[PDB]
Amino acid sequence: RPISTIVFIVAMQKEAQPLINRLRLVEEVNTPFPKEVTWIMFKGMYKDLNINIVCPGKDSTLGVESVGTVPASLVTYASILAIQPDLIINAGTAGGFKAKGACISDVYVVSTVAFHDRRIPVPVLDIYGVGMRNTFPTPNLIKELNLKVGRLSTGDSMDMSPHDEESITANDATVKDMEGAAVAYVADIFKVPTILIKGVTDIVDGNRPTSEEFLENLAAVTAKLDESLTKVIDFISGKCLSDL
Amino acid sequence: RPISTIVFIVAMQKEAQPLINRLRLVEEVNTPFPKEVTWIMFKGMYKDLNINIVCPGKDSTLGVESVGTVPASLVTYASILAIQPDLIINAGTAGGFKAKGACISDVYVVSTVAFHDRRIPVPVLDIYGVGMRNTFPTPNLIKELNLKVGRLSTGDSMDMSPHDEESITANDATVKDMEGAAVAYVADIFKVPTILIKGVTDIVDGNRPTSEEFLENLAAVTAKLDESLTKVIDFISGKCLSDL
Ligand SMILES: Nc1ncnc2[nH]cnc12
Ligand SMILES: Nc1ncnc2[nH]cnc12
Secondary structure, eight states, X not given: OBOOEEEEEOSOHHHHHHHHHHXXXXXXXXXXXXXXXXXXXXXXXXXXEEEXXXXXXXXXXXXXXXXXXXXXXXXXXXXXXXXXXXXEEEEEEEEEOGGGTXXXXXXXXXXXXXXXXXXXXXXTHHHHHHOOXXXXXXXXXXXXXXXXXXXXXXXXXSSOOHHHHHHHHHTTOSEEESSHHHHHHHHHHTTOOEEEEEEEEEETTSSSOTTHHHHTTTTHHHHHXXXXXXXXXXXXXXXXXXXX | OBOOEEEEXXXXXXXXXXXXXXXXXXXXXXXXXXXXXXXXXXXXXXXXEEEEEEEOOBOTTTOSBOXXXXXXXXXXXXXXXXXXXXXXXXXXXXXXXGGGTOOTTOEEEEEEEEESSOOOOSTTHHHHHHOOEEOOOOHHHHHHTTOEEEEEEEOSOSSOOHHHHHHHXXXXXXXXXXXXXXXXXXXXXXXXOEEEEEEEEEETTTTOOSTTTTTSHHHHHHHHHHHHHHHHHHHHTTOBTTTO
8 A cells, every 4th residue: 555644853943944844834823632732734745645743842941952862752652653654754954974975965864873972881781772673675776866964963962072982983873863773663562664864064073163063054955955855755655664 | 630641751661660560550551552552551559549551662773772862752642641640750760970969779869850962052042952950849759758859960971071071060960860851841842740760870970880880880879760750659649740
């Protein structure tokens, strides 16, 4: 049976904006979420697909985007149970490692993702900590659209301690972010097809810092990312979860 | 109006076991959760209180308890929405800092909790990262039962990098754990009264003993913790959210 509905999970609404504009998605007023959360949702029908972009929104106290693994998981759970999707995709900008060939503005399709900041020095619990997992296999996509593939490492810090560096290295990650691994975990319990797409905005093992290189590009890349997601939606439209 | 229902959130079922026994709580078979999660629930009626202990259970892949901020938040959300409690309490063992006077087996009542492993080097986002917050004020409890009070720092790692150490220091934490901050976040969105109780099983600033603090003490303290929670339940029974 063909894919009908696709739920997009984005940490920052800024990252999704362009897509929302090109597809002319409308922000759902009555969200199927609890009256108390700050989550926002944008629904739309592109060709034969019900596209839904859900974002954790802005923190009710600080007024800043609620990034991180905790809000990312809560949202992914709620969305799954609510607008039960056929395919859930986690997109957003990220850190790249040039050592693994990551240029700025590159658009990778995460293959396997794990946690680099959950170090539990215990026999089996340390594997749980890393909690590594696969993404839904989409060879025709990476092939057709000819995209870059790589592993993702997730952590609640935007910086990178020497401890994070060693683990990201043990994960063999090419891209680095703050929520991917968390999303994959939830969708995995409800066993729903999942895809993670990351736009490189900052070269972590590079010279230029991790905070200023990120800002002067969260426009240039956030743009390239959009252009890319569209063509991805465009590719799925009409297919079955296996034709991907 | 008096407190009617109390939901306990515990990372490990081992930690709660004793309490479950003394109160003779029964494990709910039909949990109000999705058929796919591995969460377990124990319900019971102690005096005039509907006590519910909810645990994320054991990982479906690794078979180890699903500790950490992600499972702790998911569970806290689901329970709130499900068995809508009047008071939610987060109990469990933790790391203590003797520098702040924390002896092994001590039983503190967290005053303020924050994250020590979500370092985001950005203007307002770094405050979000720490995401510090207060616990429900219970002076009569700490007064009557004469308990130890202290701040809690939360992080997804059981070890402690030099980076975690500096932040736990900036949080002025006396106790250290892996879920508290996450629980307080969820309950705070639904604005429900919340309490965090931690049993010190390991002195972080010490020598990290033998097969004691890591193995024995988790029995010796998990015991003292139980004895303590009971007397806490016992104190609340009959009171209003303001009499605590
Ligand atoms: N270097 C980085 N680490 C984590 N998340 C990021 N998002 C953008 N750049 C990042
Ligand atoms: N040292 C420690 N750090 C974090 N969580 C703990 N739980 C028990 N001991 C701990």
